Design a protein around this nucleic acid. Structure first.
Ligand SMILES: [Mg+2]
Ligand SMILES: [Mg+2]
Ligand SMILES: [Mg+2]
Ligand SMILES: [Mg+2]
Ligand SMILES: [Mg+2]
Ligand SMILES: [Mg+2]
Ligand SMILES: [Mg+2]
Ligand SMILES: [Mg+2]
Ligand SMILES: [Mg+2]
Ligand SMILES: [Mg+2]
Ligand SMILES: [Mg+2]
Ligand SMILES: [Mg+2]
Ligand SMILES: [Mg+2]
Ligand SMILES: [Mg+2]
Ligand SMILES: [Mg+2]
Ligand SMILES: [Mg+2]
Ligand SMILES: [Mg+2]
Ligand SMILES: [Zn+2]
Ligand SMILES: [Zn+2]
Lengths: 78, 66, 184, 50, 126, 136
RNA sequence: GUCGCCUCCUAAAGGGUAACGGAGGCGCCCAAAGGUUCCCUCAGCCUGGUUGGUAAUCAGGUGGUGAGUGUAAGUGCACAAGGGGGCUUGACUGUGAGACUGACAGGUCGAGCAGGGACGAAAGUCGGGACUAGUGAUCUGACGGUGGCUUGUGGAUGCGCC
RNA sequence: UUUCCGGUGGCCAUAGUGGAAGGGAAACACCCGGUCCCAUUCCGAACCCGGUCGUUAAGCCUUCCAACGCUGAUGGUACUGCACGAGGGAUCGUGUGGGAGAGUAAGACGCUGCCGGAAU
């Protein structure tokens, strides 16, 4: 007969948004795993080596736009 | 400018061999310039060639028959 | 020395007066002028040896008076025996008084002593007042020696002028003084 | 074989502080680097071991 | 008026300086702790503003257009140095302590450098 | 035979057979049309048979348009073989037809001969179809 | 035929999801293709020009991303993460608040701090590479350092730790 | 206070692209030089410095144009959560909630904050 010349898939990477808008986070909490900057780091958000976006401070996550970039901010909690 | 990068360029006397001399400056070495012809000495735009063309078919007809 | 080149003074007085009277611009700083001279040399036959490039550098430095921009190959082409990064051309940009004196020396000395010289074409305009022409030889420039040339080479001389249209650029170059014929 | 592992040791205390890789054709000779020696407590010159 | 795109039909120097300014602003941002010191350098004057970019409002500013600096005899670099001294004095008056310097698309050289060094002499922590 | 010059993927999932026609529900080329009232897969051989029927009836007058192209490859399992061992190779080329899709257009021919030619062509298609016109 | 890893689709707009389902890649490479600082904009098209032609090199206009990205694909990047110049070794040592992701072994991101450095005028950035593959637990043994232990004591020897 | 204008942000085309006309008081800008700090993988073109002469020609700014591009309802339709129903079958329909894309009418020749200059 014949055989299948496909069959290989990589393991699941479980990317995506981990903390959504208005969610209270600690400093250092990961907000989104991503490849590239689909989201950019905003105010109080840092970007990791693998483009992970993490909270630089305590507060609430918000998603927005800064200039032309789609950003994630962590607004300090009042 | 920089030192030790460019060739020597000093004052120079020239001759155009057509009653023309100038006080330009050129890259030559320990001597003078002797050029064949200049622009004002040239026969192009002073009108001394008048080549046009030679297309007298009827002119040659009349010269060699009449 | 401290003396404005004769071409520059003649340009200013005669040519500015002529363009003001003949084209009649409504603003004083609209009269076109010579922006720069560009001497290019495609040295494409230098992928196999580098001494011909020493010759090219010497020839065009003596012609222009400044060291050239040696340009490396942009992209590799196999139809061309051409790789990437090998320098395959050299050009000199003359601006300021140097452009004027190079233009004067070219006009008075270089192009008139071409074999069976017949002027230069006036149909070589790019469409914005800038006029380019090519020389198949480099031996007309009498400021260089004769019995020590390595190999035959040519160049492209480009006049970039601040002339909006082709007609006033042609007028500018003609009034500066160019051998212009009436043939194609 | 073509990109081997090379050990960088301090030129002061001969301490095999670092290990990295090179090409052995692009860098045929031993590599000098300015690394930090935990023993010498400062930045010293490190050389590939021979 | 700050559109993210560089407006076309701008002159070549204007386009280049706009690109340089936008690239400089990528890492420079003025907060209350460290406001941004922007020096706008034209062919005649230097206009300095210290800005809290969070609120988008200028805290203090100085220029060669002020009354006590039109008559002052000096060079362009000397006038820029006097402007740097004045802006440092005004920053100390308003309680700024430290600023982050923004060359606004120009090279840190000459008039801008003299302004920055004078502001540093005045007591600015940068 | 209508076969594409090339396709990006030769092994594709079956086209969806759900929903009314997404586009091409109105005459755009000819004066009369065949409109599909049922969905299905229209192979290139059926398209060719219908085209031959119309073209042979109408003879020399007018033009015929095929609004649907069979650019969907359908694979075939190796014959007499068990299941598995990969997907088969393409065997048929189909167009995915939905109710209300104008399949063929006809022009330059009066209404009765057009009606007869399109009746002949419709008797070749695997789905139900009807003759349509531009409101006369 | 396949067996581990990476990318996309199937996968039903969080994540996950199978088949001998559909496509491809990896078992590296780079002392710069790493760090930092500064500068630059492309491909394509049109026109003019010696060799030179569609396409080497030059000039003017137009062109916003269709070029490029070490390497598959996807997500990104023109603010460039793409092109170039200068100086460099952070391709660090001791750490790791807090998190993401797996039954677990494990995989991944990480603020702030000290030491000693690189670049910058500074702000600052740097614990390799735009990101995600380029990898192998434990046992056993080996080499360098250190000197904690050593069967009566001192050595030796052996072991331990990194 | 107001008007006009020079910088510096925010929204990131309702803002742009294109066309027509007009303006420069301070400012801006081209512009004039290159001696000096500094520079071009050649060039004072650019970067940098000294001036502010000349000029509003271009940048910039004001106004007009819906032209290209951009924004864009209401209603309907597709689709769909839940509950059902029909057909021999691909598949289809209804109740109850949600509800596009396209298209149409239409909007639109930017909105706005701070600093400064001139006049008021
Ligand atoms: Mg990184
Ligand atoms: Mg990494
Ligand atoms: Mg349609
Ligand atoms: Mg999903
Ligand atoms: Mg789902
Ligand atoms: Mg399962
Ligand atoms: Mg390493
Ligand atoms: Mg922790
Ligand atoms: Mg992984
Ligand atoms: Mg430190
Ligand atoms: Mg890089
Ligand atoms: Mg065992
Ligand atoms: Mg014992
Ligand atoms: Mg350790
Ligand atoms: Mg709409
Ligand atoms: Mg609606
Ligand atoms: Mg709608
Ligand atoms: Zn002569
Ligand atoms: Zn050491």
């Amino acid at each position: 007969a014949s055989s299948s010349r496909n069959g290989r898939d990589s393991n699941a990477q479980r990317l995506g948004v981990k903390r959504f808008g208005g969610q209270l986070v600690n400093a250092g909490e990961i907000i989104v795993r991503q490849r590239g900057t689909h989201f950019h780091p905003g105010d109080g958000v840092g970007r990791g080596g693998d483009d992970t976006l993490f909270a630089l401070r305590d507060g609430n996550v918000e998603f927005g736009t800064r200039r032309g970039r789609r950003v994630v901010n962590v607004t300090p909690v009042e | 400018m920089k030192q030790g990068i460019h060739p020597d360029y000093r004052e120079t006397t020239v001759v155009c061999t057509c009653g023309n001399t100038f006080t330009t400056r050129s890259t030559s070495q320990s001597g003078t310039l002797n050029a064949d012809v200049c622009s004002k000495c040239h026969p192009f735009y002073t009108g001394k060639q008048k080549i046009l063309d030679a297309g007298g078919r009827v002119a040659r007809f009349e010269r060699r028959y009449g | 020395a401290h003396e404005m080149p004769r071409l520059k003074k003649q340009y200013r007085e005669q040519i500015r007066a002529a363009m003001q009277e003949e084209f009649g611009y409504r603003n004083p700083m609209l009269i076109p002028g010579l922006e720069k001279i560009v001497v290019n040399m495609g040295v494409g036959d230098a992928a196999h040896d580098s001494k011909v490039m020493d010759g090219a550098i010497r020839d065009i430095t003596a012609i222009t008076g400044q060291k050239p921009q040696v340009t490396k190959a942009r992209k590799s082409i196999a139809q061309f025996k051409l790789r990437e990064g090998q320098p395959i051309g050299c050009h000199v940009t003359l601006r300021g008084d140097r452009m004027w004196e190079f233009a004067d020396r070219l006009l008075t000395l270089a192009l008139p002593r071409i074999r069976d010289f017949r002027g230069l074409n006036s149909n070589q305009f790019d469409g914005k007042g800038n006029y380019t022409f090519g020389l198949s030889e480099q031996v007309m420039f009498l400021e260089i020696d004769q019995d020590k040339i390595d190999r035959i080479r040519g160049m492209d001389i480009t006049f970039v002028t601040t002339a909006q249209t082709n007609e006033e650029g042609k007028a500018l170059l003609k009034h500066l003084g160019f051998p212009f014929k009436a043939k194609d | 074989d073509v990109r081997p592992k090379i050990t960088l040791a301090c030129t002061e205390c001969k301490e095999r502080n670092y290990i990295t890789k090179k090409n052995r054709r692009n860098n045929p000779d031993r590599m000098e680097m300015a690394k930090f020696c935990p023993r010498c407590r400062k930045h010293t010159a490190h050389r590939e071991t021979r | 008026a700050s559109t993210l795109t560089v407006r076309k039909s701008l002159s070549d120097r204007a386009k280049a300086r706009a690109r340089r300014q936008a690239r400089g602003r990528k890492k420079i941002f003025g907060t209350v702790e460290r406001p941004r010191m922007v020096v706008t350098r034209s062919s005649k004057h230097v206009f300095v503003q210290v800005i809290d970019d969070v609120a988008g409002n200028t805290l203090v500013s100085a220029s060669t257009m002020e009354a006590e600096l039109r008559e002052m005899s000096g060079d362009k670099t000397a006038k820029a140095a006097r402007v740097g001294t004045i802006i440092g004095e005004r920053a100390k008056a308003a309680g700024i302590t430290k600023v982050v310097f923004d060359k606004a698309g120009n090279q840190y050289h000459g008039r801008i450098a003299a302004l920055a060094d004078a502001a540093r002499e005045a007591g600015l922590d940068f | 035979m209508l076969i594409p010059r090339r396709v990006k993927y030769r092994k594709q999932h079956h086209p969806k057979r759900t929903g009314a026609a997404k586009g091409g529900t109105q005459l755009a080329f000819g004066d009369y049309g065949i409109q599909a009232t049922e969905g299905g897969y229209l192979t290139n051989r059926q398209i060719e048979a219908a085209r031959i029927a119309m073209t042979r009836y109408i003879k020399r007058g007018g033009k015929v348009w095929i609004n649907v192209y069979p650019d969907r490859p359908m694979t075939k399992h190796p014959a007499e073989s068990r299941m598995g061992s990969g997907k088969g190779t393409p065997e048929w080329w189909i167009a995915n037809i939905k109710p209300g899709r104008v399949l063929f257009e006809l022009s330059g021919v009066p209404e009765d001969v057009a009606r007869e030619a399109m009746r002949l062509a419709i008797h070749k298609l695997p789905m139900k179809a009807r003759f349509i016109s531009r409101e006369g």
